[PDB]
Design a protein around this ligand. Sequence first.
Ligand code: YAT
Ligand code: MG
Ligand code: MG
Ligand code: MG
Ligand code: MG
Ligand code: MG
Ligand code: MG
Ligand code: MG
Ligand code: MG
Ligand code: MG
Ligand code: MG
Ligand code: ZN
Lengths: 65, 153, 129, 96, 138
Amino acid sequence: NVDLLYPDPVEEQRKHKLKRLVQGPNSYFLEIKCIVVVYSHANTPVFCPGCTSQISIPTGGKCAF
Amino acid sequence: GRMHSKGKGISRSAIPYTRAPAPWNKYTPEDVCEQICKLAKKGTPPSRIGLILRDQFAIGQVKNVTGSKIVRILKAKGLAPEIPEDLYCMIKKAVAIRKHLERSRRDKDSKFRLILVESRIHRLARYYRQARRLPPTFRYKSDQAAALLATYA
Amino acid sequence: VRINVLRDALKSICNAQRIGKKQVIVRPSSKVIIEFLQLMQKNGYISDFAVVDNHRSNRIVVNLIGRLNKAGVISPRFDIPANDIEKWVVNLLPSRLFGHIILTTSQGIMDHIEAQHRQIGGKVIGYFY
Amino acid sequence: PVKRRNNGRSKYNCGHTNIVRCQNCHRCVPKDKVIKRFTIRNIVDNTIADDVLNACVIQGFAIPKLYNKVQYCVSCSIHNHIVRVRSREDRKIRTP
Amino acid sequence: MSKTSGLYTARKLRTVRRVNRWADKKYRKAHLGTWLKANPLEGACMARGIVTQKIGPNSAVRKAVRVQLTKNSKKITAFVPRDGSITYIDNNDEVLVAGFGRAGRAVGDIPGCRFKVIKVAGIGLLALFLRKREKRAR
RNA sequence: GCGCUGCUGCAGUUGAAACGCCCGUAGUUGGCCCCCCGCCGCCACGAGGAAACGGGAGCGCUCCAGGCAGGCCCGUUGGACCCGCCGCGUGGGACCGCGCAGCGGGCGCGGCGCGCCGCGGCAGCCCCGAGGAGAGCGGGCGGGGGCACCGGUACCGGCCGGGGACGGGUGAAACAGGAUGAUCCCGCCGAGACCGCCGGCCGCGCAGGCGCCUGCCAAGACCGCCUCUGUCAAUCAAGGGCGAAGGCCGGGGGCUAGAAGGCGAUCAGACACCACCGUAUUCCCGGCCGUAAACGGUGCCGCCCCGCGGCCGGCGCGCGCGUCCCGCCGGCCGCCCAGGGAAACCGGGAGGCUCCGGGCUCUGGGGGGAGUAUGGCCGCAAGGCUGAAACUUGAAGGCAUUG
Ligand SMILES: CC[C@H]1CN2CCc3cc(OC)c(OC)cc3[C@@H]2C[C@@H]1C[C@H]1NCCc2cc(OC)c(OC)cc21
Ligand SMILES: [Mg+2]
Ligand SMILES: [Mg+2]
Ligand SMILES: [Mg+2]
Ligand SMILES: [Mg+2]
Ligand SMILES: [Mg+2]
Ligand SMILES: [Mg+2]
Ligand SMILES: [Mg+2]
Ligand SMILES: [Mg+2]
Ligand SMILES: [Mg+2]
Ligand SMILES: [Mg+2]
Ligand SMILES: [Zn+2]
């Protein structure tokens, strides 16, 4: 019923990225419209062209806009 | 936190299996190559350079694109610093502790931390002296640390 | 720090078998582990296994079918004369009829019976039965 | 042999704890080993409360209470029946 | 684990055994040298000496004698076991003295006695107690 | 005998035995990966070099302990062969650890050098990035540390006023206080200690230990990350630093309690327990000492491991948006299936061990004499580290059962 060679893709998402059968990032890129791609876990300030200032709110984990 | 403490966490980064660039990549290695110079010309450490590239320019890994790491590029362009960054930051922390201690000399935790930092510095400096990355004559001393910090920085 | 990958692998395998499981994971993927497992498979103790690549010490999966009772390593590799094997056989294995002692030689990884046939010796890796 | 897993105290993730004094003998005891009970009671006991209320003048006057914390050592708690010596199986029960 | 087990660690093992093997009371008593000097018999099977005085939960007094070893000039007490052998020993008679079963230690209920008398004037005590021979020459 | 010297192959919670803790040199030990080259170890074979002894082929000294003989028509009758090597040679080349400094051609002599020539001949010249380590960014978290500042009652002492006879203390009393107005009530003044109820199977720190307000200075583990380096690591004689309370040296300060001392009771006695007075000390600065049941009486690093539950910090997911429930990391705890053990008990190991080998360090070998003597080092001293023997003795100890 269950085999470790082909883990359920959803059951594996609940585990730690290093104890997985293959180690992989937990981060990604996404698109935002003020057309610009931004890192999911941004920590440094980010600026956008028409913008006059920063639009990121750094946090412990995922950023906010 | 293992070598000079008792804790043992495991906070690290796991890079992807595939070495290829993104399918939205629009930079030839040249564009990144000169960008490094501009940040280097402003006295920026390699780690901050990587963070800047990853955040603003959306480049997760430089090696996947140029085929080489940042410090190798800097050395090939003759801009790499004489002291590796980690040792330099170690020495900065040692200097700050020493100054705080000269200000007041009743704090003992500070002395304990200073002992640990000096031990780490000596180990790393010995390792770097081997591998011929530093001159054999290089030596770390408490009383003239700030001079070697500023002159070589 | 981690040192003997083979010992940890064997201990994990024995613990898993003790509660009668069917599949195990072993972080290291050294060549010596691979030859040890190949000998076990050929003799009929563990059947199948696969190696899972990741660029960072690949992982390996193995299947169990009972049978195996014990398996260990000898941490400092001694030197075994071709003519001095019966003493180790008697000291380590339960009976002279069954059991396999692994030796690494200049001719490759083999069992004590094979080396006794070729009248050569070497270094000892481990054992199982 | 060992009689209790807790060694007779509640000491976790520390080396030293502040000390207090027993209220009846004035012995010094660690704060995690002393026996504590919180009590709430009336200043005037219950038999004369009605007389106190009748003699009082304010309307709706509420009887004030007393809020105290009593701390006793092991020897004095036993001698005054604050705790009982229990059986081997009953030492593991932790309800009031 | 606890002990060293590396392939290049024989020196430490030899040193450790050399140091730790001195903890045994028997090994100490045999290889240290103190007992040999302190033993009035100096490692001999038995000694020849000269008697100089007769003395003697169980409440039975045991008969013994004070002796001085010819080659040593120190004093000890040796106990004459076999019945009726007190009369067979006379003051200032050459004797041969051996040891009890337990080397060094006292044997039985006798306090402060660690030897035996086996010959007087050159005749075995056993050969005389059974009347095989006679001490008419002394 | 003896697995009571333990390499094979001991023990270290309670029987004897884990240094108080950290750093750290010699020393020991070190993840994974390159298919064939050289070197070290390693294995096999071989040479060479004394016999006797030992093993061993054959021979009926009447057997034997022995000896190398002996029969007729004897291998050329026989006395074969092996065994005292850290060295020498050949091969193997898995395991064990080192190889920084381009190559190919022509001048160029048979070769090898030292140089000059096209780069015009080469894919010319970087494994990866360890649930190893270090550095970096962001986030909050905490009785973590040091410096200055600072509030509050309470003990004590003094004073203004009131009032009029006992007060204190004990199991019961008696010493000390009171018409010089005590005890009691109120207010004010002074100094020095301390930081409560909240306060906890909460938390922080290498340990010892850590709790008033305000502000300042540096530090730290964890979590999150497709940020950087590339083995930089583990453990440790010698050496260095920290280290409760008490104690010591030199200066300050002087309210509480209180060794020594004194006094009253109790007692057969009581120079002790109880009552009262009270010096050093307890507080601050600078410096010595370097010991504790300094205890989880359990060394550090590392892997696997039944299930349930609580709390702390950070992150993420889902929804009906509640400080909800479903997970991840790290930490502090409780119960417990197997398993283990002399058992009590452990089970986030004291498991995976007579089926008896992951790495490093330290300690112990029946009880006393004895942590004594004699030396050495450290210390102002008190004392600390190191550390015997003679002699004596048959039991001393651990966990548990019934009385
Ligand atoms: C033999 C000395 C004890 C007897 N004395 C005098 C008489 C006495 C009378 C008491 O009331 C009946 C009394 O209170 C219990 C004590 C005494 C003393 C106490 C002496 C013994 C003392 N130490 C041991 C036991 C004990 C127990 C006590 O009970 C708490 C006690 O009272 C304070 C005193 C004592
Ligand atoms: Mg270390
Ligand atoms: Mg780790
Ligand atoms: Mg008891
Ligand atoms: Mg403590
Ligand atoms: Mg003990
Ligand atoms: Mg003190
Ligand atoms: Mg201890
Ligand atoms: Mg063992
Ligand atoms: Mg023993
Ligand atoms: Mg002894
Ligand atoms: Zn009390």
